[PDB]
């Protein structure tokens, strides 16, 4: 059984995620509209980069609500968020993938297909893994609690670059891993391999993070510049 502390924490991560989602779709009409070459492709790219900026702000606001994140130094708080942002973005992207339409819905009604992603200015080398991962995630069928716990485990990764106190980070990850392991045993007691399969997704997210780095490097060669916010997180 889950302890009262485990239950309240799980519910709090779920509540923190619903709140980020609610205040984001509320602040949706303040995004460059989605519209033939030149100017329209520039506008399409500006639209797509603005959605990423909203997600970075959302992730930062969620992290602050994650118990234990405020125990870390400002230094390590940045180091963890810097590396986790895209991995969290991809997890959330997989969560808004529709099997019937083969489309990802950002915010409230912004719906995108594989073609729409290529129109925004992304490589097939990066689009295919997104949808490949989105379909792979659909097969697990994670609830709001399992998604929230996975993000918390992803945030508190001690092996991230520039982490001054990895011991502190590893100690903070432990209660979340314990919570997900307990939740899994309660939810589906028949499927013992549900928990390792969720952790195998963290393995996949690291490869996807490298693919995303290759996508950013490709944009520099394509003379497409990133906004000041996204440049701070995703550049050499
Ligand atoms: C050109 C570079 C800088 N890129 C982009 O401009 C971008 N824009 C879309 C941002 C997704 C916003 C998003 C994610 C997840 C959840 C919610 S939300 N607001 O609906 O909760 N929004 C990327 C992206 C695409 C798919 C998955 C992850 C990243 S990119 O890094 O290739």
| 62 alpha carbon – ligand 1 mean position (Å) | 16
| Residues within a 6 A CB radius of ligand 1 | 21, 24, 48-49, 51-52, 54-55, 58, 89-90, 92-93, 106-107, 122, 130, 212, 215, 226, 230
Pairing label, strands 103-106, 110-112: antiparallel
Cβ contact 73:164 at 8 Å: yes
DSSP code, position 234: S
Q: In the chain, what are the domain boundaries?
A: 1-236
Q: According to the CATH classification, is domain 1-236 in 1.10.10.10?
A: no
Write out the E strands in 108-206.
110-112
Cα separations in angstroms, 81 against 71, 96, 109, 144, 234: 14, 22, 27, 21, 12
Instruction: Identify whether the C-beta of residue 92 lies closer than 8 Å to the C-beta of residue 137.
Output: no
Within 10 angstroms of residue 16's Cβ, the number of other Cβ atoms is 20
Of 93, 128, 129, which is best to mutate to test ligand 1, by the most ligand atoms within 8 angstroms of its C-beta?
Answer: 93
φ and ψ at residue 108, rounded to 5 degrees? -95, -65
Q: How far apart are CA 3 and CA 5, in angstroms?
A: 5
> What stretch of H or E contains 105?
strand 103-106
Cβ neighbours, 10 Å, residue 116: 17
**Ligand 1 centroid, distance to 92 Cα (angstroms):** 9
Beta pairing partners, 112: 104
Q: Looking at the chain, how many residues does it have?
A: 236
Half-sphere exposure of 207 (CA within 13 A, CB side): 10
Rounded to whole angstroms, the Cα distance separating 48 from 215 reads: 14
- Say which residue the tokens 């007691």 belong to: 189
- Solving technique for this entry? X-ray
């Amino acid at each position: 059984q889950l302890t009262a502390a485990q239950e309240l924490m799980i519910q709090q991560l779920v509540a923190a995620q619903l709140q980020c989602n609610k205040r984001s779709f509320s602040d949706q009409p303040k995004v460059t509209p989605w519209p033939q070459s030149r100017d329209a492709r520039q506008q399409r790219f500006a639209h797509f980069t603005e959605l990423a900026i909203i997600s970075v702000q959302e992730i930062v606001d969620f992290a602050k609500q994650v118990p234990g994140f405020l125990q870390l130094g400002r230094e390590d708080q940045i180091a963890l968020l810097k590396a986790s942002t895209i991995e969290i973005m991809l997890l959330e992207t997989a969560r808004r993938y529709n099997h019937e339409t083969e489309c990802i819905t950002f915010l409230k009604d912004f719906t995108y297909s594989k073609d729409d992603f290529h129109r925004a200015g992304l490589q097939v080398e990066f689009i295919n893994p997104i949808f490949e991962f989105s379909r792979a995630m659909r097969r697990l069928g994670l609830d709001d609690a399992e998604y929230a716990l996975l993000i918390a485990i992803n945030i508190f990764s001690a092996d991230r670059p520039n982490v001054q106190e990895p011991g502190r980070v590893e100690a903070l990850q432990q209660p979340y891993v314990e919570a997900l392991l307990s939740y899994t045993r309660i939810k589906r007691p028949q499927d013992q391999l549900r928990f390792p399969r969720m952790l195998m997704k963290l393995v996949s997210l690291r490869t996807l993070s490298s693919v995303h780095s290759e996508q950013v490097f490709a944009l520099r060669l394509q003379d497409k510049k990133l906004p000041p916010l996204l440049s701070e997180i995703w550049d050499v």
